[PDB]
Nucleic acid binder design. Structure first.
Length: 127
RNA sequence: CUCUCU
């Protein structure tokens, strides 16, 4: 998006101490951060005893605007009370929605399920 | 005294 004339240069987030519990979080961060800009790719971990998510954007100017608007406060019904801040990494790396993370320019990711191919993989035996 | 090498 980047539809604002002001500065911005940190395209990825810590998103800590959310209202949240599991990987629905990431698609919900997508659904509420889409209101600011072009959210990209997400992690979801229990940070030892806290909860956290970890998200990259397209546009650091929209991500500025969302840190502004969502680090400063929630949005409605006392129900969106995020801590949200820029990373030290500043280019987040997805793994798998197996236990950790998905990406939306990837398929869905998979979960590591992906099968053999009996032309080339099992082909020495195949059955 | 805070941020995933499934």
């Amino acid at each position: 998006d980047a539809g604002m004339a002001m500065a911005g240069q940190s395209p990825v987030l810590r998103i800590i101490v959310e209202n949240l519990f599991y990987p629905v979080t990431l698609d919900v961060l997508h659904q509420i951060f889409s209101k600011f800009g072009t959210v990209l790719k997400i992690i979801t971990f229990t940070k030892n005893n806290q909860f956290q998510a970890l998200l990259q954007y397209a546009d650091p100017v929209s991500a500025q605007h969302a840190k502004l608007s969502l680090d400063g406060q929630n949005i409605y019904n006392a129900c969106c009370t995020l801590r949200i801040d820029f990373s030290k990494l500043t280019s987040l790396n997805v793994k798998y929605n197996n236990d950790k993370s998905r990406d939306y320019t990837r398929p869905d990711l998979p979960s590591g399920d992906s099968q053999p191919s009996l032309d080339q993989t099992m082909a020495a035996a195949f059955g």
